[PDB]
Chains A and B, each alone.
With several copies, the nearest count.
Chain A
Amino acid sequence: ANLWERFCNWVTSTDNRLYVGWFGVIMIPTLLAATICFVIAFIAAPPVDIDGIREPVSGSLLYGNNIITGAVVPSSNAIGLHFYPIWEAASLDEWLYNGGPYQLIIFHFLLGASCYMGRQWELSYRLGMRPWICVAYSAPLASAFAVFLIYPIGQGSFSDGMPLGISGTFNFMIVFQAEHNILMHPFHQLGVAGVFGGALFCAMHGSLVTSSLIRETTETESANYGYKFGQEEETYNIVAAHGYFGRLIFQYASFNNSRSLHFFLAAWPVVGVWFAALGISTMAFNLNGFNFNHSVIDAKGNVINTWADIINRANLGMEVMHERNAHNFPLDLA
């Protein structure tokens, strides 16, 4: 075998402790670059003029932040969607002032994570598995793309992408609510049903299986020793779990088929999160949450407030305060 064949065999080998593969060939360097840049920046990067108004925001630990307040800060509004690699800057000091690290990190990360998805497909193929775990991973991946790439594209600037930090994430959410009324958007609502529902069904399934574990141990040992890795028989009694849950609600509201049950466990959070992502991705082009401001009016024409109008007052507070030095004209149009 020639060197190229040998190389291919190693790359695609099923015997490596961590699978490499062709997607991995792109994934490994890209993720390494984003990770190393992120760590260095989070610790040591100087303040970044996020909104392009010569008002630098400090994100790093050494420059006055803790874990909660710290972030890698989005690139400058003056840059917009322009590509800003290191080599476009006159110097590293310039690169840092303008938020170059943010772009390096999000681009390497989105590429690497896309490749992580591909790699899940690939290993599934090498092992003779069915292929759709990667489809499940498309839901969180799409969500990352929405907040790091699609929202910036729609708004015209990477300065409006989600910051790489805890408090910065909260900032992104609050401004998003001011600008799009996301809580009143049905795709975010489906998202919430997706994650609340996912947590519910996680707990529910965990609890039902745990409840029907077949006795294999004594009281003085963990019941977990009753399962042995790779044993052929199922470790809990699905018939009993179904008898239970079926009587909790009614018979036909409970799954008796383990396959349908597990498909449901996959599909409910995945679909809901797909809609969460599509929410952000469509509010990116300013198709916003439902607007019922002054929808209810009395016989004379007096406005009768509903809870929607209280939401509106909250959103106004957010709107009038955000980026307090960046607007010169009355309408915030992106």
Chain B
Amino acid sequence: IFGIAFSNKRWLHFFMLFVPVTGLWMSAIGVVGLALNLRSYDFISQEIRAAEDPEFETFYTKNLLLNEGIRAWMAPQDQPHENFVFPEEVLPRGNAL
């Protein structure tokens, strides 16, 4: 069916331990970086190109605009100690919405 198959039961069950255990460990490492804001936030080459060329668009740049919406719309209530007052005119919004 698939081209390959397990033939060793011991290896099969070890692998069942290995896969999800290693995945979770990897996610943990990423979160340690996020503790320091050490993000994978951007691709620098993407940003240099898009800054220079207003016709260049990818799903990557499209998602960043969504992130910017999230930040501006959620911060005042989600981070009350900051006392954010964002006047209506500065809120990021596309046409009509």
Contact = CB atoms under 8 A, between A and B. Distances in A.
Q: Do chains A and B make direct contact within the complex (CB under 8 angstroms)?
A: yes
Interface of A: 18-19, 47, 55-59, 64-66, 68-69, 71, 119-120, 123, 163, 165, 167-168, 170-171, 174-175, 199-200, 202-203, 205-207, 209-210, 213, 223-224, 226-227, 229, 235-236, 305, 309-310, 313-314, 316-330, 332
Contacts, number: 159
Contacts of B94: 320-327
Nearest to B61: A69
Contact of A174 (B20, B66, B72): B66
Interface in B1-36: 1, 3, 7-11, 13-21, 23-24
Contacts of B8: 224, 227, 229
Interface of B: 1, 3, 7-11, 13-21, 23-24, 43, 45-46, 49, 55-60, 62-63, 65-66, 68-74, 77-78, 91-97
A119 B1 contact: yes
**Interface-centre pick from A55, A65, A167, A317 (highest chain B CB count, 10 A):** A317
Contacts of B16: 202-203, 205-206, 209
B93 A69 contact: no
8 contacts: A69-B46, A167-B60, A167-B63, A206-B13, A207-B17, A314-B73, A322-B65, A322-B66
Nearest to B76: A313
Interface pairs A-B: 8 shortest CB-CB: A324-B94, A206-B16, A321-B69, A317-B73, A206-B17, A317-B69, A209-B13, A167-B59
B57 A58 contact: yes
B96 A330 contact: yes
A317 B57 contact: no
A316 B63 contact: no
Contacts of B46: 64, 69
Contact of A213 (B10, B73, B78, B96): B10
Main secondary structure on B side of the interface with A:
helix
Contacts of A320: 69, 73, 91-94, 97
Given A170-B59, A320-B69, A309 B49 contact: no
B58 A310 contact: no
Most buried by B among A119, A321, A330, A332: A321
B17 to A, nearest CB: 3
Nearest to B23: A199
Nearest to A217: B10
Contacts of A330: 96-97
A321 B93 contact: yes
Contacts of A203: 16-17, 20-21
B10 A235 contact: yes
Given A224-B10, A314-B73, A318-B69, 18 more contacts: A57-B62, A66-B45, A71-B59, A119-B1, A165-B59, A170-B59, A171-B62, A174-B66, A199-B23, A203-B16, A203-B17, A224-B11, A235-B10, A236-B13, A313-B73, A317-B71, A321-B68, A325-B95
A171 B69 contact: no
